[PDB]
Amino acid sequence: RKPKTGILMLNMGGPETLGDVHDFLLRLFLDRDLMTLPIQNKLAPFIAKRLTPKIQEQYRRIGGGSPIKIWTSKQGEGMVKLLDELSPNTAPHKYYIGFRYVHPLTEEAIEEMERDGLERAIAFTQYPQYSCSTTGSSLNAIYRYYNQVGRKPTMKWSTIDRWPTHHLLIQCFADHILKELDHFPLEKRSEVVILFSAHSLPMSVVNRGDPYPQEVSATVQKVMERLEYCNPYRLVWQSKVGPMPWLGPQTDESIKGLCERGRKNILLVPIAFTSDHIETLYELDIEYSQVLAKECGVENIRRAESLNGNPLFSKALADLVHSHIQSNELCSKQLTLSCPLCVNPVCRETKSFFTSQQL
Amino acid sequence: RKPKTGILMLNMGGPETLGDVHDFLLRLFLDRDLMTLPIQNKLAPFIAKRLTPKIQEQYRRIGGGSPIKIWTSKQGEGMVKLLDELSPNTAPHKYYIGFRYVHPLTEEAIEEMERDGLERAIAFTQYPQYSCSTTGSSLNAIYRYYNQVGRKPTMKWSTIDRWPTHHLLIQCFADHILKELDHFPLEKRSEVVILFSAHSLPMSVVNRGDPYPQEVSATVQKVMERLEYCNPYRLVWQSKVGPMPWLGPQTDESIKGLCERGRKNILLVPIAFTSDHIETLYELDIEYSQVLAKECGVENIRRAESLNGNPLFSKALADLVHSHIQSNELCSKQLTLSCPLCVNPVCRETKSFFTSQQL
Ligand SMILES: C[C@H](CCC(=O)O)[C@H]1CC[C@H]2[C@@H]3[C@H](O)C[C@@H]4C[C@H](O)CC[C@]4(C)[C@H]3C[C@H](O)[C@]12C
Ligand SMILES: C[C@H](CCC(=O)O)[C@H]1CC[C@H]2[C@@H]3[C@H](O)C[C@@H]4C[C@H](O)CC[C@]4(C)[C@H]3C[C@H](O)[C@]12C
Ligand SMILES: C[C@H](CCC(=O)O)[C@H]1CC[C@H]2[C@@H]3[C@H](O)C[C@@H]4C[C@H](O)CC[C@]4(C)[C@H]3C[C@H](O)[C@]12C
Ligand SMILES: C[C@H](CCC(=O)O)[C@H]1CC[C@H]2[C@@H]3[C@H](O)C[C@@H]4C[C@H](O)CC[C@]4(C)[C@H]3C[C@H](O)[C@]12C
Ligand SMILES: C[C@H](CCC(=O)O)[C@H]1CC[C@H]2[C@@H]3[C@H](O)C[C@@H]4C[C@H](O)CC[C@]4(C)[C@H]3C[C@H](O)[C@]12C
Ligand SMILES: C[C@H](CCC(=O)O)[C@H]1CC[C@H]2[C@@H]3[C@H](O)C[C@@H]4C[C@H](O)CC[C@]4(C)[C@H]3C[C@H](O)[C@]12C
Ligand SMILES: C[C@H](CCC(=O)O)[C@H]1CC[C@H]2[C@@H]3[C@H](O)C[C@@H]4C[C@H](O)CC[C@]4(C)[C@H]3C[C@H](O)[C@]12C
Ligand SMILES: C[C@H](CCC(=O)O)[C@H]1CC[C@H]2[C@@H]3[C@H](O)C[C@@H]4C[C@H](O)CC[C@]4(C)[C@H]3C[C@H](O)[C@]12C
Ligand SMILES: O=C(O)c1ccccc1O
Ligand code: FES
């Protein structure tokens, strides 16, 4: 049977092999939704070239590439299997991967959805908490694709643009946390401090009104409420680079600070993504857990397993799509409000692209 | 009958009259938990004298003083009336006001609780979301009182140190929001943007691990869930002073930014306060809503009424205390963890003061 409903799973992506690092960086430095640079068309290739060896080495240290596409594919397959059974009125469903900066690109996926002759298309961000830099850029890329090719869409579009507190997402995190807690020595379990760690943002982005940290905070509170506040926690922020001010405290400084203050049993939780990648496999596991924490005299540090192939997570995704379809929503109410200090004219046009869709 | 259980309601306080401004400022600038100054014992009275006229002027513009004591008293009376019926085994209950920087001072309230020969004493912060600079300083003040007086307490202490998502608090906020939405022109209701506004913090405090912004965000998400995301929103931050970096976006810049971008119907919600203060009556209502908003060409701007005398809020307070009593809790799990980058030796001692209390 011909596919009727397409689910476009949006994520930034990561280089599958060390060879893919350069083009990954190049596409990213060319993204003007993500960042504006002087003489950008010339600086982008240069910075990409400059950072490539260092970034290649990081991927080498985790096994030679990003597992994002594998996890995204498995999650997508599980989601589709479920949707075909619980939403027959919209079946057959098909998932499409649209990575922002690596193949398959958002544009390539849209091309394939069109050729497949879908009746309905759903832009399903794989970031549960909205940031204009991630989800925003991915949604902008969809509007721009149609603008650039000078044609209207042939499919009815809509977006699931955020889902920071979906009860099944919450259950998966809480589940993974309890599992990791079971892996601490029993005598230390109650003493464990939970560090929720989300990718930081530079303060220039926070200060223009980015909804990300408030939504991340909502996810954290929902998870802790489900865990009945069994352990104390803090939300901290990782991956800052460069000399500018970013939102803190930093995950690395917090780990060190905790240890210096006698809290030497720490559970790291990657609360802002749904599968592994460099930020967990290299930064958290190698840099912070193996190296930093050893230097600080930690007793036990562990990290909750990423959601990855958890079947309940596939159920979360299917439920999200199912409710979205049944409610006839075009986008969240939140998408109808741009940042109070937004300075990117495409944000408004992208917002309108979704809110104005024919039903 | 002699009071059995005392509920110490902790808040910063504000000057009751213009004459109270100087000593208010003086006590504040002397609080080393709040801030460290060079030659502090000399600079504190000077800065107090220096700011006094300007601050007096602000209070004059709202009617000549802070209403915090009036509202705290009414809330406390309502709370106690309920508590005597909810929990007769701990009755008679009595409330005490412990303001940090004005009479009646935290220390004066403790002296009175001690004289009243209470069996049970509860440090009940009136800030729903914990900040080390507010609730932290108030709890520190209690520990310091006993330490400075050289005597152990004759009462069994515990604390309700935060309550950012208490279901009745959330209902009060949602109710006041709906009531305010009803006051906009019907044709503009759906177009209204909600700006949740909380007091900002300097980034130096955020970056040391202050739990405040994450808890404020939790309160915001709970309120919006209850409202069924009826309007789009942003959490923004007010009251920054001085040249240093603070958490943004600023409420004032956000109001102007919304107006320049065509969102001219705005509902302000003071989400981190439970009664009126200079921050609502002067900063939001006069500076932003009367002056700034008119300059920006706003169509409609309103502020949700503070919780103040809502009898449902009194019910929230009673329910909190009642649940605290029933659970035999000494403090939240969160209090057992100080900031990862805390540099105040007293924080740990105060934490221990509460966690170690005889039951
Ligand atoms: C903070 C920023 C997004 C915020 C923004 O729009 O300004 C994020 C999103 C993708 C990130 C980049 C990508 O993860 C790729 C690179 C990863 C390296 O480990 C650091 C630099 C690196 C180039 C990252 C810098 C920065 O953290 C980026 C750009
Ligand atoms: C000033 C500009 C950022 C301005 C903006 O974002 O619009 C920054 C961002 C990236 C910077 C460049 C990149 O870091 C790459 C180069 C790094 C070298 O150390 C300096 C030149 C170099 C070419 C930088 C020049 C300048 O500091 C840049 C271009
Ligand atoms: C570290 C990296 C490359 C620097 C180099 O080694 O030459 C530089 C190049 C572009 C920079 C980014 C861009 O200038 C865009 C962002 C600008 C914000 O002010 C800080 C974060 C921000 C995301 C920058 C972080 C970091 O300094 C980047 C990613
Ligand atoms: C009781 C002891 C010394 C107090 C004293 O000298 O009077 C104090 C000093 C440091 C404290 C420890 C550190 O603060 C680190 C931990 C903090 C946790 O909240 C309790 C256990 C924890 C391990 C603390 C237990 C206990 O209160 C300690 C060990
Ligand atoms: C350096 C210090 C802040 C650092 C700290 O918190 O210790 C700041 C905070 C308050 C400042 C003081 C107050 O603003 C009052 C005075 C203001 C005058 O403009 C300068 C001297 C003056 C006396 C200031 C000196 C200095 O800039 C102070 C003392
Ligand atoms: C942000 C800060 C607490 C955080 C901290 O400094 O660590 C808050 C708590 C009480 C605030 C102060 C009090 O509200 C009293 C003053 C009110 C005036 O409108 C501004 C200065 C003023 C002196 C405030 C400055 C600042 O916002 C303070 C000091
Ligand atoms: C504005 C006020 C008085 C300035 C003056 O009249 O001289 C000054 C004096 C002390 C200052 C505060 C203290 O220095 C403590 C805090 C220091 C942080 O770096 C900024 C906020 C911080 C809370 C300061 C805000 C503001 O600049 C204050 C409150
Ligand atoms: C349709 C019109 C411009 C048409 C265009 O040139 O393509 C756009 C431009 C500015 C838009 C308005 C502004 O963006 C402000 C409002 C934004 C809200 O999300 C919708 C209503 C709202 C009032 C918008 C309605 C409509 O989409 C407007 C009026
Ligand atoms: O946690 C933060 O530091 C923060 C900052 C802005 C908005 C919401 C937040 O939780
Ligand atoms: S930057 Fe947030 S909507 Fe444009």
Ligand code: FES
């Ligand atoms: S500053 Fe937060 S516990 Fe000390």
